[PDB]
Structure 1
Amino acid sequence: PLLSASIVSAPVVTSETYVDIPGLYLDVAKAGIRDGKLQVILNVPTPYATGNNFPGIYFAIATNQGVVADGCFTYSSKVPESTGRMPFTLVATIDVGSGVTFVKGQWKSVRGSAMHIDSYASLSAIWGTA
């Protein structure tokens, strides 16, 4: 099976720790998936960050066990003239273990940054065998 969740905005937040991106959540157990592998793609094509010291955003794919994979974008100037849109994609292939019932997207601030999604973003998964 294939799974998909998409949003067209998220509340603007800051957080020093990972917080859920609302709506980017896949219920793997509800899909009847209890083993095998899932290729998970977190696609945030048009984010930006605001801040005062090389802003950016750390993104994660998380399961019941916590963060399984992470990454980030950051700007290359201390205070960008304009905080441009920085497409971001993270792929992680995970084993659906007895204890994996969901996958979700999360994010946290780089250097105090406020985190912005104001258009399409998605979390997708395709199941397969090893």
Structure 2
Amino acid sequence: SIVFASIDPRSNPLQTSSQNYVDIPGLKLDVSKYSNSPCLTALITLNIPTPYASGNNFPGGNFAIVTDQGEQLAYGGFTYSSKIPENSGRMPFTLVARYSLASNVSTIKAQWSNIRGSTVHIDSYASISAVIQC
């Protein structure tokens, strides 16, 4: 089966300058119906196709897939190749994780954080999805 959530915050863009990971609002999957099911697994893709980051010390952004049981299932990020890019170019980002559904998991969700004092931005379509299989 498929579980899916997307956002498209054109009118009210998202940003973070947080050094710690914080939730990306709207990018959460409810997997309660499948929990406590050791024979099931979720393959989870976080797709942030058009992010950027502003800043003045080799800016970038980090992303993670986590559960509400404190498991960091995957992480990664982008950075620029200059200290102060004259344009914060759009840097497509995708991240793929796996999680057994054996445990009492309820939520699989996206988080983000900054790098070197940057501000990370999302102002367009992004998604999180899972394929759940036996």
TM-score bracket, normalised by the shorter chain, equals over 0.9
State the partner residue of 1:27: 30
Alignment pair present for 1:2 and 2:2: yes
Alignment pair present for 1:65 and 2:66: no
Inter-partner Cα distance in structure 1 for 2:28 and 2:125:
15
| CA-to-aligned-CA distance 1:70-117 (integer Å, 9 cap, x gap) | 001111111001000000000001111323111000000011111100
Cα deviation, residue 13, structure 1: 1.9
Cα deviation, residue 68, structure 1: 1.5
| CA-to-aligned-CA distance 1:26-75 (integer Å, 9 cap, x gap) | 0100xx11221000000000000001111110100000222221001111
Is the CA contact 1:55–1:111 (under 8 Å) kept in the aligned structure 2? yes
Cα deviation, residue 11, structure 1: 2.2
Amino acid at match of 2:45: I
Structure 2: gaps spanning 5 or more residues: none
Is the CA contact 2:43–2:98 (under 8 Å) kept in the aligned structure 1? yes
- After superposition, the CA RMSD in angstroms is 1.0
Is the CA contact 2:53–2:119 (under 8 Å) kept in the aligned structure 1? yes
SS, match of residue 59 in structure 1: strand
In the alignment of these two chains, the number of paired residues is: 127
Structure 1 ranges of 4+ moved more than 4 A:
none
What percent identity do the matched residue pairs reach?
Answer: 54
Distance change in 2, residues 1:97/1:64 (3 Å)? farther
Inter-partner Cα distance in structure 2 for 1:63 and 1:42:
13
Query: Which region of structure 1 is more displaced relative to structure 2, 7-16 or 75-84?
Result: 7-16
Query: Which region of structure 1 is more displaced relative to structure 2, 102-111 or 58-67?
Result: 58-67
Query: Which region of structure 1 is more displaced relative to structure 2, 60-69 or 117-126?
Result: 60-69
| CA-to-aligned-CA distance 1:3-31 (integer Å, 9 cap, x gap) | 110001252221010000000000100xx
Q: How does 1:118-129 map to 2 (within 5 A)?
A: 118-129=123-134
Q: TM-score, normalised by structure 2?
A: 0.91
Inter-partner Cα distance in structure 1 for 2:21 and 2:44:
18
State the partner residue of 1:108: 113
